[PDB]
């Protein structure tokens, strides 16, 4: 599977994947903050 880096440059692949992962993490975190159960800052009761 090492040959995929033949097709794609390590540096552009690294920066693109880094931005993608950070944006996805931010999006998931904001979704969780939007939900009542999983907002760890408001801390709504499970009940």
């Amino acid at each position: 599977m090492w040959r995929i880096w033949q097709l794609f440059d390590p540096r552009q692949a690294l920066v693109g994947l880094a931005t993608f992962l950070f944006v996805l993490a931010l999006l998931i975190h904001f979704i969780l903050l939007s939900t009542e159960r999983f907002n760890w800052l408001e801390g709504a009761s499970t009940k």
Binding site: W2, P10, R37, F38
Partner: protein, 45 residues
């Protein structure tokens, strides 16, 4: 890219992806222990 450096990048990229997935899996297991995110038939509680 050169195959010689491609092998090295693939090796340590594989190690780094293993590290990231492991840390994320630990985080997910901690969150699941705190509050599971798969509801039961009657909701959550």
């Amino acid at each position: 890219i050169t195959e010689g450096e491609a092998k090295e990048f693939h090796k340590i990229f594989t190690s780094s992806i293993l590290v990231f997935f492991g840390v994320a899996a630990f985080a997910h297991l901690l969150v699941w222990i705190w509050r599971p995110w798969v509801p039961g038939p009657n909701g959550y509680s």
